[PDB]
Amino acid sequence: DFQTRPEIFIFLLSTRAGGLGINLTTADTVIFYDSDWNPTIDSQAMDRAHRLGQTKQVT
DNA sequence: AGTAATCCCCTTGGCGGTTAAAACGCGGGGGACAGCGCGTACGTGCGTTTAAGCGGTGCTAGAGCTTGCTACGACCAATTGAGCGGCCTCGGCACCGGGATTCTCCA
C-alpha cells in the first residue's frame, strides 16, 4: 500500500520488527522518534529508505 | 542477570444463513385423584416359657513384643530396543434411497 500511492504521508514502524526487511524507497525522510542503543539497527532502519532505487536524497 | 519486543497458537467473540429443533394451539382421552364399601390383616393385651443376661471359674490358644541376620529391594552407571509421535491409505461404518415388511387403530 505505502509503495503504491503517494497520498499516504507517514509510515509508523517499530524498530526491530520494522527495521530489517524490504525496500521503502518512495519515502524520502526517516525520523527516529527514539533511537536504538545498538547503532546497527538504526542503520538498518535508515537503509530501508537509503537503498538502491531510492527516489530522492534521504534526510 | 533483567525486562520488553516479537511471534506462535489457541482460545473467545462476531457475522451470516439455513434449517433443523423449540414453541405454540387445540381437541380429546384417559390417567390422576377423590370417594365409597368391605374385609382381612396388623396392633393390642394376656398367660406362658424360654433363653438372654449376669456373676463366677478354668484353660490355652495366639496376640503382641524382642533379638538376630540375611535375603531382597534401593540406588547408580552403561546399554539398547520397546514404545511414542508423525505420516499414510484403504476399508469399515454411516448415510441415503427405494421397495418390502411390520404394527398400529378404527371399523
Explain this structure to me?
- The structure is cut from a larger assembly and holds one chain.
- This protein has 59 residues and is an all-alpha fold.
- The protein has helices at residues 15-19, 39-49.
- It is globular.
- The termini are far apart.
- The protein is built from two helices and no strands.
- 27% of the residues lie in helices and 0% in strands.
- It binds one DNA strand of 107 nucleotides through helix 1.
Strand and helix layout:
Blueprint: H1 15-19, H2 39-49
The chain binds one DNA strand of 107 nucleotides through helix 1.
Write a concise keyword list for the protein shown above.
59 residues, DNA-binding, globular, 1 chains, part of a larger assembly, mainly alpha, 2 helices
* Fraction in beta strands: under 5%
Taking the alpha carbons of the first and last residues, their distance comes to 22 Å
Q: Structural class, please?
A: mainly alpha
Can you count the helices? 2
Counted beta strands: 0
Residues in helix, %: 25-40%
Helix/strand order, N-terminal first: HH
Shape: globular
- Assembly type of the chains comes to part of a larger assembly
How is the biggest beta sheet arranged? none
